[PDB]
């Protein structure tokens, strides 16, 4: 019941943090990894032999509510136009809020896409896509 | 052609030898054009843009600056009329 | 003639939208006057007309509305589109007031509807952008047996007029 | 005790006025409000960080015995069929009894619907719900 | 008080007839209508612009005691079965008993269900509800 | 008996105060609040392993009798039309009628809705039903 | 809760203006974004060692309710047939409402798809998909 | 509210006609079209330098009820089996009901597909997808 | 309201006929189309100079609960296995309930496939598609 006691993670309990900032009104954050498992097979047998790691692949998806100040184009971190070739290589973590404890880190991200969205008598919303080096977890 | 066209919250002070402009009045600035236009010259021109070009990202906000000199206008009485000049310091006889 | 064409073009504008800057598809003008000529009409309230040759083409537009009457301190009486504007409203309101309170129905309609009524045909008004704004709270009715005098404030819309550039070359 | 000096309203004491005319033998008048109060939360904390009014929505019935004469649909202001669109945007006040004076004002009510009844050894009645853009108080 | 000089109709001083009969011992009338009124947002601004009616929609109820002959059914217009492919669009009139004054006519009713209840030292009652094109109101 | 000395607390020795000043002429005052309270299940057993406090959501409604003077809107605490737009977050207190002490507080509360009623032969009420971020009891 | 002092920016305090017009009764503005992310890799290392940024691309589609005057045809933004060989480039900014500033404007859109929708009982709207060279954020 | 007032075109306030005839109980007009807009690349830089309308493309659908007379088989305008070898180009118009004015004109339509829906207990409805030369509005 | 009077075709008053027999509880009947409508484009214009129907092509599909006797594998309309090298051409006909009058006819119809589903506590239901030569109609 408590949050120390509990013993499975929570939204409630997980901040978001970007170059050692926390990332405020952050709405969701998924990862996502593809290890190119490929199977090997023969003439004279049906099934697969063994499977081969061929490529790492990863993704990171952030959705966030568009603050009024510091949103991702004002704070630096996203960018419009040419301002992409001048920002240099990113990290992201996820963190525990109670001891500040990293759970996951995603080594260097680098967003594909930039997406925002208006709609009438909704709260504005925005979403990047990193693709990232790698990924790991300490402590 | 009177229609036409022709081609931060920490407010921050400045105070000392300004040499152009009506001493003794407080001035609110918002543009280095205005300071030209009203502070000829002196430490206190610079101090304006350096202020406003202090840092690449940062910089001050509309700054309050008064000329702190005891200066005055020139003036003559001549024919009819007593002229006097806006322009206040020395440079004012020219 | 000239003025003929000129009344041709502003009787087609939207209600409201000024002859200013407005195309006048003359072919050519028997034109003395220049930039400080043009400012000494128009100062004067007399219209006047300025041959534009663009990079690639040629037109003639009218610099501004200015009425002959000479104070400008009412634009209502010194530029046309706003006296229009002030013209149309006007009529307007005095119908719906004809209509709503000029039936005679009672005495009992109170100054407190009256101002209640004037508010939602300001509001209706915001609505259209026919005006800019106008004070919510800063209407009074007084009333007096039959006679009900009112007074009311609006923002005419604040046309935009001037820019100014200073060009800096550097490097 | 006297309608001077009573500190509350009441029935009594308040006219129900559409048009300028006052509106005979109405029965009640129940205003409705919603302002689409949305709560923000996030990742990383529990409550609510903000409430934004996202759509302002309101609404009005009014209900009244059938008057032989000036009912709504003979008075004017209900209407049948095609007549709907033939009927302008119209604006309800209440209003004191004593002093006349504007209580609140709904400004620019419009139908949603017009409902009847007869019934045995009872008087018929009529309710009107009606949209409204705003509403304020004056004075 | 009297018939003449009341202002108020009465289910006592209303009758309720059909294709130009009058309905004996009908006991209620609900007439329910809806204009579809939706209100038209946008972004930049909190209320409702305007008010569109989209769709008219109508229904009538009529309530009565199972007469012993001519019941609705019998009468011919309720029906049961495959008979209902078969009843033309009837009208409907509600009349004041004195003058035989038209108050409101319901255009062209037609059936959308038929309810019987049998009871145990009850009267036996009768439910039709109508919907209908449109209403109206003349003279 | 005595005010002092009873044990339970009663509507006639407990004020209701928004603002630091007394609401005069309350009839109710009902609180509401929901943890989210999701259990955790598996493959493999029955029951929940666990109870995880998600989300904080929390309502108060205040019912009044429209004063004649200082209602809701006159007070300036509700507001009608784009008026909310321009309404700061209010804070509600409720408080013993004794010693004038905290019972509980509503920190920040917020309107959802502004609900009035005019009846034949009955005092006006108002219902206001607000959300509010947090609440608290000191002392 | 004021709109001075909310966190987040909400369709309600936006306005979306084209070639310094306000556009009226718009629904909704959707930014698309594509960095083209490519990530390198080689024999000898299963993960990515670098992400290049090949080529921009952007979206932008504004939906709106068909205005009787003014919409998008009448207007002179959108065009049909061969009259898109005439529209020149044009530029459309979303604009903070209460202030007038700028959040992002998007440089030198032009049109996609022009799309239309009549339906029975239902409020009439468009849409336009714009490509655009570049978007920017200024002050 | 009222026809003349409203600001936004609905499915009541339109009519749609072809050949000079207006079409009886059509449920839907949707308008598609695309400009083909390709974006000019380099080398030297991320950005597309402009954007080209290579080819113009345009549907209109069509949903009706299939009326039990004039059908669009019966009616003459679609067609079935070798007639459409037949059957010359066709014009659709999309008019204002109130003052007959045209809202657009799709020059020249021609068939793209028939489709056509018998279901239980359902209405019988049909569709048609016509390709166009071009569209446009006048006055 | 009457069948005789009724302007829109409704699944009640359509039979639907096979080989001169009508299907008892067919569920739906879909009859799609297609033209192949191909614009002509050139060098020097941007719009499509015509449109030429290359090809047409024709589906029917029929859904049917699964009778106990006569269904389509026991009455020999479908078939199943090499069977369907000996079924014939065969010609569905869609006929008016009251006049016996065909509304539209697919001459020769042929099965692409048959689809069975047997499911828990569900009405057992069958499906064929057919392609066809041509349709048309006729009175």
Redesign the interface.
């Given at each position: 019941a408590s949050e120390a006691k509990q013993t499975v993670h929570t939204g409630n309990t997980v901040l978001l943090m970007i170059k050692g900032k926390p990332v405020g009104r952050a709405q969701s954050a998924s990862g996502q990894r593809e290890y190119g498992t490929t199977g090997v097979y023969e003439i004279g047998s049906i099934m697969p032999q063994e499977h081969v790691y061929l490529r790492y692949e990863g993704t990171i998806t952030v959705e966030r509510l568009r603050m009024k100040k510091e949103n991702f184009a004002d704070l630096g971190y996203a960018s419009l136009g040419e301002e992409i070739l001048k920002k240099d290589i990113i990290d992201i973590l996820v963190v525990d809020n109670l001891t500040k404890q990293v759970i996951i880190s995603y080594h260097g991200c680098s967003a594909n896409n930039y997406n925002e969205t208006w709609q009438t008598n909704e709260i504005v919303t925005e979403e990047i896509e990193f693709s990232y080096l790698t990924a790991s977890d300490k402590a | 052609?009177?229609?036409?066209?022709?081609?931060s919250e920490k407010v921050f002070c400045l105070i000392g030898q300004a040499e152009g402009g009506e001493p003794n009045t407080v001035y609110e600035l918002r543009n280095y054009?205005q300071a030209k236009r009203l502070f000829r010259s002196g430490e206190l021109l610079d101090a304006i843009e350096l202020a406003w070009g202090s840092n690449p990202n940062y910089t001050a906000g509309r700054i309050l600056a008064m000329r702190i000199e005891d200066a005055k206008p020139a003036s003559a009485e001549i024919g009819g009329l007593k002229i006097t000049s806006k322009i206040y310091g020395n440079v004012a006889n020219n | 003639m000239v003025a003929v064409a000129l009344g041709g073009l502003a009787s087609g504008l939207e209600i409201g939208e000024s002859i200013t800057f407005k195309p006048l598809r003359v072919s050519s003008l028997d034109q003395i006057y220049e930039s400080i000529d043009l400012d000494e009409l128009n100062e004067n309230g007399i219209i006047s007309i300025e041959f534009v040759r663009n990079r690639t083409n040629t037109f003639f537009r009218i610099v501004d509305d200015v009425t002959t009457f000479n104070d400008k301190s009412d634009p209502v009486k010194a530029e046309m589109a706003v006296g229009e504007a002030n013209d149309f409203l006007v009529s307007e309101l005095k119908v719906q007031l004809e209509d709503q309170f000029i039936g005679t129905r009672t005495i009992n309609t109170s100054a407190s509807i009256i101002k209640d009524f004037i508010q939602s045909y300001l509001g209706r008004k915001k609505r259209d952008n026919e005006i800019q704004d106008f004070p919510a709270e800063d209407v009074q009715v007084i009333v007096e047996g039959n006679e009900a005098r009112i007074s009311m404030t609006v923002y005419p819309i604040r046309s935009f007029k001037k820019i100014s550039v200073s060009l800096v070359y550097k490097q």
């Open positions: - | 052609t009177r229609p036409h066209a022709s081609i054009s | -």
